[model samples]
Target: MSLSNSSKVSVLISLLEKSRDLDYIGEAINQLEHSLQCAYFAQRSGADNEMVLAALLHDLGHYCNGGYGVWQHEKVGADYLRGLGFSERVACLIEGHVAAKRYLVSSKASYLKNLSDASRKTLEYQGGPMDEGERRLFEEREDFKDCLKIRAWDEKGKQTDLKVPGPEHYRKMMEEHLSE
Candidate 1:
């Protein structure tokens, strides 16, 4: 059944709380920490509400599963958020984060070298790099820059010792953005 907007937001908050202690795909930090770190980076960079939300929710699909391959979590997460009435921009940002990684690797020789081991292995499945045409198409999207920014933050978020505000800290922003 389709859930109410408030209910959906509540569910998301619960998911964040529940997944907080789980391993973040072999990253140094748990899922909650990484998500919080990404959101913190976006907020510190003065991103808009939608962008901050995107950063917070970018990896939600990793928690919600439906038989799709792990590589499609971006699309799955975006679609799920869109279904919950979140802004298209937020959904697009979620969908494009992985593409941003591909774009960076394709455009910058040193980019791939810096990826974490988990990221490197997943890169092979996510498609190693954006081919010329793919890069051109990805570049044309309005959220392309934000996607790249989020991807960078996503990578940097692996630091286990990093301190970030807890998910509850984002409750006001989450409530403000939850579509009715």
Candidate 2:
């Protein structure tokens, strides 16, 4: 069924489930583990339900609609969640992960110091860093901190052998958040 249908949540959730063992770029962990670990980090940080959901669905675009190709997966995932009836806050938080990366690399000399060689290279294709004007605008966003928050979780979510729960763990929260 199309995502606009009433069962959007079911369809999207199943897609997330199917991503269980898929590759996570060059990371050691699988896609599903990274997603679940991100969600766990959000919950442990005391984020609200919507934020938690955003963390779980943060990378959905990597496997959604057959994939988001190379870039804009953040936009694709965030917009997809919005279509599924999640809040605009959720969408922005989800979409801002990439933006945060751009800000981190360009704005902070310390952050880029230890960044992986692959990630540093990918950042070039991820639009490089923001110029002074863009950085000023980015810092002004109300969701800027949350964007950074999710990114931090994403980096830490790459742990191997972490015992994370299945998608069913968040089924109740996701179902309640759906507009249908």
Candidate 3:
């Protein structure tokens, strides 16, 4: 059987602290910093608790599974969180951010202008911009708007000096989500 909700939340909190120094690839911030920043943005944007949690965990796959070099890091993270008792919507939104990246790149001409250099490079490996057909399919998904919101926040998460709450700060939230 899986660990209790409290145990799982502690495991998650430890993992976040453990990855404190893990580099965010070519970006200047570390993985933990990036995730915290993303969470900050999600909260600032008036996201629900689930979305805020999703933002905090969006890149956790990079720490526990593989870094951004892995094409399926999004799915890997989502599934891991799902098994750990996070909401289905949170998991899907975690996965959706990547698809949102592809959608945004293809549909919005200006989206590419603000992409960080690392993201710009990784976009090629992420299948490069989406096609019209792919964009249409993506638009029809239930998580489309939430995905876009996450994608926008994900991009902003790379700030090098943004001081935000640590994973421990969300312990109660995580435990409560797991209990639900």
Candidate 4:
């Protein structure tokens, strides 16, 4: 059965809050803080509500149950959002953020320097970076640009000292994006 709009919002908040204390890939910041910081960046950057929500929930797949690891978590989260009736753009960003990272790593020699140890470890499992054909194909998509923006925010979101709006502050905004 599908989730009601209210239920979806409730569940999202609950999951995020529940994982608040869990460290993100051994990073200094916890999962919830990372998500909040990403969303905060989107908000501060003047992104629309949907983009903000995309940033907020970008890593939802990683927290999901079962064996879906980093290799496939982006698609997992994107699929979940699509199932919940989120816009395709939002799902695309979620699904393609990894590709964005890969793209950046391939295009910029210094891009890998920003990654945490865990991120670097996972990069090998994430295909390292896009090959020539993959890069060309990925660049053709319109979402490619925003996905890079989201990836940049994702990279910067791990700072432990940065203050951002809490999950409660996003409840209404999230509900607004839920399927009616």
Which lDDT values do the candidates have, in the order given?
Answer: 0.82, 0.79, 0.84, 0.84
What value of lDDT does candidate 1 attain over all alpha carbons?
Answer: 0.82
lDDT of 4 at 51: 88
lDDT of 4 by residue, 4-78 (tens): 787888887888887776677756778889899999999999998888999999988877542223558899888
Worst 10 residues of 1 by lDDT: 62-71
Alpha-carbon error at 16 in model 2, in Å? 1.0
lDDT measured at residue 106 in model 3 versus the true structure, 0 to 100: 94
Segments of candidate 4 deviating more than 4 angstroms: 66-69
lDDT of 3 at 136: 92
lDDT tens digits, residues 26-128, model 2? 5676778888999999998999897898899888878786222346788888887776678898899888888788888787778876454435666778888
Instruction: Tell me which residue pairs clash in candidate 1.
Output: none
Could you tell me which 10 consecutive residues in candidate 2 have the lowest summed lDDT? 63-72
Listed per model in order, the count of residue pairs whose N, CA or C atoms clash below 3 Å is 0, 0, 0, 0
Candidate 1 regions with alpha-carbon error over 4 angstroms: 66-69
Tens digit of per-residue lDDT, candidate 3, span 1-180: 189989998888887888877777767888788888998898888889999999999877776654544567788889899888788999999988778988998988799986876578788888999998999999999888888999999888887767888888889988898888
Cα error, candidate 1, residue 116 (Å)? 1.5
Count of clashing pairs, candidate 1: 0
